[PDB]
Design a protein around this ligand. Structure first.
Ligand SMILES: *P(=O)(O)OCC(C)(C)[C@@H](O)C(=O)NCCC(=O)NCCSC(=O)CCCCCCCCCCC
Ligand SMILES: *Cc1c(COP(=O)(O)O)cnc(C)c1O
Ligand SMILES: [Fe+2]
Lengths: 402, 81, 124, 73
């Protein structure tokens, strides 16, 4: 028997409507979209244009502003590196957040190796950047600002509209990573003053290996192409545009546009149910991230005096994720939890719960029950629990580390 | 059109209960129920006809996807016991 | 997810605690610098110097819990001198831990030596 | 058989067991509209393996009618 999937932040199941839209292009309409002389190319091109319009309609943009990529990693790379390289002559400074995704960070690391100066903005305990630091960090040679729309580990929403207003008022390009936000919360590039936006297909129940980047044309923001070739996608992403993948991404964007309100209500209700049930049973459980600016789909909880790898192993019937270092290949703890000021004792106990379009009340109740039972068992197995129950707080009692 | 809408509702529920995967089956049934109860008090015949057309398109998609999912079926979830 | 670690993590083996105030009980409390994995090991050396009872409590990954339970199983039924013969290499091969989880066995070994030490200190 | 039908009707229509009398109407007494009637008929088909035709499904408007169709078939 297969476990229950509560790991929507890592990837999503393919929506059946998306696969239904894809399948004609995986069997019959297999022509190259860049073929100009026969009907296979024309029909592939028409499907590509329809998908582009669907994505643009979801994010409220012009179709010409949408460029198809292989994923949000490629989109983030294109945004960061292309904007940095195009305006290198005058602007040599980048601003981003310490809690951004690994792609954005590593791109900033590469640009620093290429001679750029990158400012990594700190976050408060809530996980939200303070706008005063952003204003004070902007220099005359700042080209790009990158702030996550919805965090993928703790689910904290950033003030995208205010950041965009600040960036537009200072003549600084603003890029937002909307991989966890597209199709789940309302997004409009015009009202939020977004210049660049990254979209991931498999975070919105679409195909894997496909993505979109939004590039504003009024006012025009320019990027230097990172992939060289025939000049497809207006010269910013060369290579053949995969018709089934972009068709699926467009179908997923259309389904999200049709179902966002219903999905948000259901997911909010389920998230409140999960959080309240866990809090009312297990003591010493806290949620990482500010609940007032939190997307309900991504719930990060830290279970005190229990380690997260052991809890993950206990809940073998539920597919979950943790920021503990015991779950990392390099034994690297979550840097997002470090940035939000979680003490070393409590981020080894984080568990990320994911609720999405296909999560049932049946699953949430089972996950809550098993989590309560196994957290109680592991606490009965833990020495820190005895120290706390005996009244000797862990800050005043020590043991020989190493 | 009361008989037509009820027959379409019955057909969609019958076909959605045939979804091999637990997530797809539960979502399809719940969504059909909610969508039919949301548009219960719609009086414009044009709006009703548009809803029925979307309903038939969704029925065709559901039929195709249920067949595809049984052609490629996996084990049941731990919650399905 | 090796079966040997899964096996010790489920169906708990000698989980508990002993009387700290008892003269013939040695408590070993240690931790790991990289990750926080903290195991408390207690050995009851009663009668003519034999560890009849041993209990453990561990905060840590499934590998740490498996190592602590394995150490508790091994240390039982032998004198204190025989207990010091337990090494981290033995636990590592018994559990077949991956190279990333190398530190877990050494922590359990450090835990046994600590208890044996506490016991000898209280014995004089 | 009658015991199972009452439980199915009470669970599907969301009413207490005592309120489901043999002469209770699904719409007038138990408070269910056409959609709930369709779901109730479909549930009666899953619990007791059978294929109720459209006319026979339509004629089931009360608990007595439901008890009757299952006992007969
Ligand atoms: P009963 O009380 O006798 O009658 C109830 C009805 C609804 C028949 C009656 O109230 C009525 O006639 N109302 C008028 C309005 C109406 O009937 N509207 C319904 C139109 S059809 C509709 O609502 C569309 C539903 C689409 C569902 C799509 C689900 C997709 C799921 C995912 C697929 C992958
Ligand atoms: C998952 C994720 C990515 C990576 O997207 P791909 O489509 O897999 O390249 C990038 N950014 C964020 C915020 C993500 O959550
Ligand atoms: Fe560990």
């Amino acid at each position: 028997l297969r476990p229950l999937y509560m790991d929507v932040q890592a990837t999503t199941p393919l929506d059946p409507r998306v696969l239904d839209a894809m399948l004609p292009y995986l069997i019959n309409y297999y022509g190259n979209p860049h073929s100009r002389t026969h009907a296979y190319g024309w029909e592939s091109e028409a499907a590509m244009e329809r998908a582009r319009q669907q994505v643009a309609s979801l994010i409220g943009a012009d179709p010409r502003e949408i460029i198809f990529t292989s994923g949000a990693t490629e989109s983030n790379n294109i945004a960061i590196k292309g904007v940095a390289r195009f305006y290198r002559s005058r602007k040599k400074h980048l601003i981003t957040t310490q809690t951004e995704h690994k792609c954005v960070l590593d791109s900033c690391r590469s640009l620093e190796a290429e001679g750029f100066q990158v400012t990594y903005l700190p976050v408060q305990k809530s996980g939200i950047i303070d706008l005063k630091e952003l204003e004070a960090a902007i220099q005359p040679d700042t080209s790009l600002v990158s702030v996550m729309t919805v965090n993928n580990e703790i689910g904290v929403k950033q003030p995208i509209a205010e950041i965009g207003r600040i960036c537009s008022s200072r003549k600084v390009y603003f890029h937002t990573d909307a991989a966890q936000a597209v199709g789940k919360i309302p997004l409009d590039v015009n009202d939020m003053k977004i210049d660049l936006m990254s979209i991931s297909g498999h975070k919105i129940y679409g195909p894997k290996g496909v993505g979109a980047i939004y590039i504003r044309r009024r006012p025009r923001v320019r990027v230097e192409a990172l992939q060289s070739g025939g000049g497809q996608e207006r010269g910013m992403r060369s290579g053949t545009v995969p018709t089934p993948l972009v068709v699926g991404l467009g179908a997923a964007c259309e389904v999200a546009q049709q179902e966002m309100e219903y999905d948000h209500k259901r997911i909010s209700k389920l998230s409140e149910r999960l959080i309240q049930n866990i809090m009312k049973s297990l003591p010493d459980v806290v949620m990482n991230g500010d609940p007032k600016h939190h997307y309900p789909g991504c719930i990060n909880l830290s279970f005190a005096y229990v380690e997260g790898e052991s809890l993950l192993m206990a809940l073998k019937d539920v597919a979950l994720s943790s920021g503990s270092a015991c779950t990392s290949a390099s034994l690297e703890p979550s840097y997002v939890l470090r940035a939000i000021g979680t003490d070393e004792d409590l981020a080894h106990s984080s568990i990320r719960f994911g609720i999405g379009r296909f999560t049932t009340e049946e699953e949430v109740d089972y996950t809550v029950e098993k989590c309560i039972q196994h957290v109680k068992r592991l606490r009965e197995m833990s020495p820190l629990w005895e120290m706390v129950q005996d009244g000797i707080d862990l800050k005043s009692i020590k043991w020989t580390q190493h | 059109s009361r008989a037509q809408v009820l027959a379409l509702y019955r057909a969609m529920l019958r076909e959605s209960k045939r979804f091999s995967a637990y997530n797809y089956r539960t979502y399809a049934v719940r969504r059909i129920r909610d969508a039919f109860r949301e548009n219960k008090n719609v009086k414009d015949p044009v709006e009703i006809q548009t809803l029925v057309n979307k309903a038939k398109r969704d029925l065709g998609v559901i039929r195709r996807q249920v067949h595809i999912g049984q052609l490629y079926s996996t084990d049941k979830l731990i919650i399905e016991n | 997810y090796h079966k040997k670690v899964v096996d010790h993590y489920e169906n708990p083996r000698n989980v508990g605690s002993l009387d700290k105030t008892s003269k013939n009980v040695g408590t070993g409390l240690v931790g790991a610098p990289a990750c926080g994995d903290v195991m408390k090991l207690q050995i009851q050396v009663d009668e003519k110097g034999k560890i009849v009872d041993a209990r453990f409590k561990t905060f840590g990954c499934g590998s740490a819990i498996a190592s602590s339970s394995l150490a508790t199983e091994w240390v039982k039924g032998k004198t204190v001198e025989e207990a010091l013969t337990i090494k981290n290499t033995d636990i590592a091969k018994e559990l077949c831990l991956p190279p990333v989880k190398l530190h877990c066995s050494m922590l359990a070994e450090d835990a046994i030596k600590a208890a044996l030490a506490d016991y000898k200190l209280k014995q004089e | 058989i009658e015991e199972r039908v009452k439980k199915i009707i009470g669970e599907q229509l969301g009413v207490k067991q005592e309120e489901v009398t043999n002469n209770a109407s699904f719409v007038e007494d138990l408070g269910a509209d056409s959609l709930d009637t369709v779901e109730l008929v479909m549930a009666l088909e899953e619990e007791f393996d059978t294929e109720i035709p459209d006319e026979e499904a339509e004629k089931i408007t009360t608990v007595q009618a439901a008890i009757d169709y299952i006992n007969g078939h």
